[PDB]
Coordinates of C-alpha atoms and ligand atoms in Angstrom, one line a residue:
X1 CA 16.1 20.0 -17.7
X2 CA 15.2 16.5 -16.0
X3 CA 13.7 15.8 -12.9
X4 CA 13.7 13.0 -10.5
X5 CA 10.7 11.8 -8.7
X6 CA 10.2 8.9 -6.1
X7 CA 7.2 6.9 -5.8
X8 CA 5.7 3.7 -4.9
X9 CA 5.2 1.2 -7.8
X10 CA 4.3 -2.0 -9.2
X11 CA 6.3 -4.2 -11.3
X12 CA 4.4 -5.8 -13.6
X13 CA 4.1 -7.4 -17.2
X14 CA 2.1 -5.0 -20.2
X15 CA -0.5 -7.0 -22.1
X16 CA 3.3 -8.0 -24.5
X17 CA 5.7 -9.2 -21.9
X18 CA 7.7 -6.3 -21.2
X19 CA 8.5 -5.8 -17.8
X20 CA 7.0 -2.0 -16.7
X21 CA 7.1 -0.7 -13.1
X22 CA 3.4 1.1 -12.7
X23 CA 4.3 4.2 -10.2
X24 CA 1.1 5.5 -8.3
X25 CA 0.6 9.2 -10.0
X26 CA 2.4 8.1 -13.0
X27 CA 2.4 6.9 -16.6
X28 CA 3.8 3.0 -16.9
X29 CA 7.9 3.5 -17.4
X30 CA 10.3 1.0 -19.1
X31 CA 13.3 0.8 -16.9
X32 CA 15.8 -2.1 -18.8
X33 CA 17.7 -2.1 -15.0
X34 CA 14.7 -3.3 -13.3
X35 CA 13.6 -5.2 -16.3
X36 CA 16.6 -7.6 -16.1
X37 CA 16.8 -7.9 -12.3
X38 CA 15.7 -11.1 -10.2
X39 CA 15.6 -9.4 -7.1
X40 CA 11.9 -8.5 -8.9
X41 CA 9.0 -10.4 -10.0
X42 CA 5.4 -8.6 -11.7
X43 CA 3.5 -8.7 -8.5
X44 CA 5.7 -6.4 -6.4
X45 CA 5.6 -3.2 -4.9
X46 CA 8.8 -1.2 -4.5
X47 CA 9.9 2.0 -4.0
X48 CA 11.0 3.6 -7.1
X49 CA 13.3 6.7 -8.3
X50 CA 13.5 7.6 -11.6
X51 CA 13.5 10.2 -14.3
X52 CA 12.5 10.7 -17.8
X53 CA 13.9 12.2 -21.1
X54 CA 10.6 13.5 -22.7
X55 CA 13.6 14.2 -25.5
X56 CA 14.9 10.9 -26.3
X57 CA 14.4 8.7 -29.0
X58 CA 13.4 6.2 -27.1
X59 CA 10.5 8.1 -25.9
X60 CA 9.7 9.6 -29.1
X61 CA 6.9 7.0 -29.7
X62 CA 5.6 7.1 -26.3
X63 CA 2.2 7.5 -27.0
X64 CA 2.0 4.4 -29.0
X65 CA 4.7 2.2 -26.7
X66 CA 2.3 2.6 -23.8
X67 CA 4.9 3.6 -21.4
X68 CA 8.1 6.3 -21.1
X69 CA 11.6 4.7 -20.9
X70 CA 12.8 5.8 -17.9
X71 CA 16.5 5.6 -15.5
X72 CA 16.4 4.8 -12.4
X73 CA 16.3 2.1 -9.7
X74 CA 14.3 0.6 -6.8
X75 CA 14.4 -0.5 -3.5
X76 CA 13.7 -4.2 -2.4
X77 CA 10.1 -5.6 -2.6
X78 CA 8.1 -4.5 0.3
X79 CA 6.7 -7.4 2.3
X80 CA 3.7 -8.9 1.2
X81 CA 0.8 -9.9 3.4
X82 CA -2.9 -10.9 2.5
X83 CA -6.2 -8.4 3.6
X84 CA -8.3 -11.0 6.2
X85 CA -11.7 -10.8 6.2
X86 CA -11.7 -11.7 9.7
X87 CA -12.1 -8.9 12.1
X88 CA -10.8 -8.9 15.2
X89 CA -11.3 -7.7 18.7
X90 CA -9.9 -5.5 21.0
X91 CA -7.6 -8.2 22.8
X92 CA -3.9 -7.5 22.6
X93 CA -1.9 -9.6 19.9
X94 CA 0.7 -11.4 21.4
X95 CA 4.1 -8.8 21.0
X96 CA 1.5 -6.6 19.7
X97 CA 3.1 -3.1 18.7
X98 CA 1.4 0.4 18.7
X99 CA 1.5 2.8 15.6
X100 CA 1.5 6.1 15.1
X101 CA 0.3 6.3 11.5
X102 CA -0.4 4.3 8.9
X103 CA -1.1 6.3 5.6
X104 CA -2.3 4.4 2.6
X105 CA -3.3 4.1 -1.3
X106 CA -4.2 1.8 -3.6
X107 CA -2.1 1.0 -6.4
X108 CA -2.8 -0.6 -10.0
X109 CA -0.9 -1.9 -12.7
X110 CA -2.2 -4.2 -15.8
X111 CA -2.6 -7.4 -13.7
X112 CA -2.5 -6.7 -9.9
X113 CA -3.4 -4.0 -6.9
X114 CA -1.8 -3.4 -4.1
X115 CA -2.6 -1.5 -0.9
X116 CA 0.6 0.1 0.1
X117 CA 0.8 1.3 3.6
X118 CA 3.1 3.0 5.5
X119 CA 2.7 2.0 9.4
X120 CA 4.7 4.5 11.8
X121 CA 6.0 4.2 14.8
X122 CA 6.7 6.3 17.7
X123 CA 10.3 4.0 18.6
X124 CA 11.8 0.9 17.2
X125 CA 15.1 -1.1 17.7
X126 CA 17.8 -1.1 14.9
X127 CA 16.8 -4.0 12.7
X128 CA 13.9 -4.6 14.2
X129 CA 11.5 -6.4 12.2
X130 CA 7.8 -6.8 12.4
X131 CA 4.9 -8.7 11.0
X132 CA 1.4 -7.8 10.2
X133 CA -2.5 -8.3 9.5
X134 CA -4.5 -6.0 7.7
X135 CA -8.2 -6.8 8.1
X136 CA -11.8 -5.6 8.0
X137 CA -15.2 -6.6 8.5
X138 CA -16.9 -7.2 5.1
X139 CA -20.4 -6.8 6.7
X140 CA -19.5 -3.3 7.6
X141 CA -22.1 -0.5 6.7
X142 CA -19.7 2.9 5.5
X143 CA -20.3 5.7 7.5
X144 CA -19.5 9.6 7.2
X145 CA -16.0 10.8 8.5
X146 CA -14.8 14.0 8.8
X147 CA -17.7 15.2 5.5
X148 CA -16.8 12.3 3.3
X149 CA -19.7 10.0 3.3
X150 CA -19.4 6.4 2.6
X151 CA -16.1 5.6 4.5
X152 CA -15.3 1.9 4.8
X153 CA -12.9 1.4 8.0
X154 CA -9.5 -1.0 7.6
X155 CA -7.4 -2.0 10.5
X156 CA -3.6 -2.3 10.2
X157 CA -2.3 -4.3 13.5
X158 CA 1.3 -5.5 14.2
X159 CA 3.3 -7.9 16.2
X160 CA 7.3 -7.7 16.5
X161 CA 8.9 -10.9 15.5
X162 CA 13.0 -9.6 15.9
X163 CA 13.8 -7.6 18.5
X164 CA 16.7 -5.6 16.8
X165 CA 19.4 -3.9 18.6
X166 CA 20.8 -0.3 19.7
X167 CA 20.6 2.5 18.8
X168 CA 16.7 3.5 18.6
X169 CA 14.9 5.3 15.3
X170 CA 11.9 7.7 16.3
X171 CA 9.3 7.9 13.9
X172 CA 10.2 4.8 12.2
X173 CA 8.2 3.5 9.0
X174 CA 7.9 0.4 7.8
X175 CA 6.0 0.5 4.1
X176 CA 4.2 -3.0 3.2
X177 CA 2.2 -4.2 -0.1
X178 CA -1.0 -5.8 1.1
X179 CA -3.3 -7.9 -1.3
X180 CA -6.2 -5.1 -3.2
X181 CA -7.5 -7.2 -6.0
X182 CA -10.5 -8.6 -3.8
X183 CA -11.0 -5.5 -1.9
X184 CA -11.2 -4.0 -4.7
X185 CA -13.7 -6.4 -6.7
X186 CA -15.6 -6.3 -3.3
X187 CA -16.1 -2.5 -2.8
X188 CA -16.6 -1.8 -6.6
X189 CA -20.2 -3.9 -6.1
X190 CA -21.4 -2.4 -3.2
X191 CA -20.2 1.3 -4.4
X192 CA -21.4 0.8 -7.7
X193 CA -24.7 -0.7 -6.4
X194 CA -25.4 2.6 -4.4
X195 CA -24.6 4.9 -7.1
X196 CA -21.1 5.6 -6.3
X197 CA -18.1 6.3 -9.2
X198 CA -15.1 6.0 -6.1
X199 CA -14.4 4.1 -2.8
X200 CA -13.4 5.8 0.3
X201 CA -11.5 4.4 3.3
X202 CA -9.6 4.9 6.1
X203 CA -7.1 2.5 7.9
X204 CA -7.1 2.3 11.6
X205 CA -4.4 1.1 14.2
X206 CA -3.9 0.8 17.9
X207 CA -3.1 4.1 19.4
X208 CA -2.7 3.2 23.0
X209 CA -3.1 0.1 25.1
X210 CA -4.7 -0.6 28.2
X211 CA -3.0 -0.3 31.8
X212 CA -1.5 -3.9 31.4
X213 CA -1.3 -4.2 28.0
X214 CA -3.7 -7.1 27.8
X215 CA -6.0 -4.8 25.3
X216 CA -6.2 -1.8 22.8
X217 CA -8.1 1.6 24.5
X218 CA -7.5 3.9 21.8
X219 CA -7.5 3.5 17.8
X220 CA -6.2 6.2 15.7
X221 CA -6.9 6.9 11.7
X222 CA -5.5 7.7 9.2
X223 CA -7.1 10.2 6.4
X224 CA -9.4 9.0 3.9
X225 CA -7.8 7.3 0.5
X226 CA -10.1 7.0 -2.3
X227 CA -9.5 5.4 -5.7
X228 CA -12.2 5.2 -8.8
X229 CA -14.4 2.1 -9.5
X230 CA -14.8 3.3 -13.0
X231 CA -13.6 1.1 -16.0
X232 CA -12.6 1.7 -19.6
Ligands
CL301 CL1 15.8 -1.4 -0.1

């Protein structure tokens, strides 16, 4: 009868106060748990699981609540970090790490976006922890990739801050909320300006490094993630 799903959200206030987590590829839920939790504040991304009674009564007035009450719970907030506007080069970060992926979307909820994205790695230590920058150039023509045209080009770069311990994790990921309200207000001009009703991007990360580690050779990419710059 019910079905779980799990997916990244934002907790966040509706335009009343009630505290609503804001999954991406779903409707707003009402989860009372979460609701009553400090562990959370609106502004936060976590990974959530949850399922709905279409038949309740509580959900009987969905339509004009706004949102479905929903059971479930949520992992801790992902880290936050801000998206720079200051590109960099291709000089290794000090205890700069290399990733193997870094998948992304763009979230929204009543107040905030969020970029969540889910670097990868090929090895890390046991409680290993890591920091990051997310950045772009915001002079940056779009270019076609792969058929899309109109692709504007992140970079997700990290640095290890705790070394962790035994034993290794392979294929390690480490999912983080970055800052999308700018971006978004940025790339919603220039799209709109040339005609466009979506943005396109792509996030790219260091692949490989050089012989002595003093520099990035190869980048990889993730696939394109695109989100609508229409309004009500
Ligand atoms: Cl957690």
């Amino acid at each position: 009868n019910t079905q779980q799903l799990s997916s990244y959200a934002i907790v966040d206030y509706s335009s009343t106060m009630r505290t609503l987590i804001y999954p991406l590829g779903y409707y707003p839920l009402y989860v009372a748990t979460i609701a009553n939790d400090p562990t959370y504040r609106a502004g936060d991304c976590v990974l959530a699981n949850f399922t709905v009674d279409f038949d309740s009564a509580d959900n009987a007035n969905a339509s004009t609540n706004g949102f479905y009450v929903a059971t479930g719970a949520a992992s801790s907030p992902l880290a936050k970090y801000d998206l720079s506007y200051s590109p960099l080069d291709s000089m290794a970060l000090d205890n700069e790490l290399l990733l193997s992926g870094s998948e992304s979307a763009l979230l929204f909820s009543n107040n905030y976006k969020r970029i969540v994205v889910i670097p990868t790695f090929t090895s890390v230590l046991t409680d290993q922890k890591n920091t990051y920058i997310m950045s772009m150039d915001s002079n940056q023509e779009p270019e076609t990739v792969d058929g899309t045209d109109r692709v504007y080009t992140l970079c997700l770069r990290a640095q290890k801050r705790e070394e962790g311990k035994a034993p290794t994790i392979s294929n390690a990921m480490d999912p983080i909320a970055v800052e999308g309200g700018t971006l978004y207000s940025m790339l919603k001009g220039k799209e709109s300006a040339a005609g466009k009703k979506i943005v396109s991007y792509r996030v790219k990360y260091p692949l490989t490094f050089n012989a002595d580690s003093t520099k990035i050779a190869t980048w990889g990419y993730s696939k394109i993630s695109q989100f609508s710059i229409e309004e009500a």
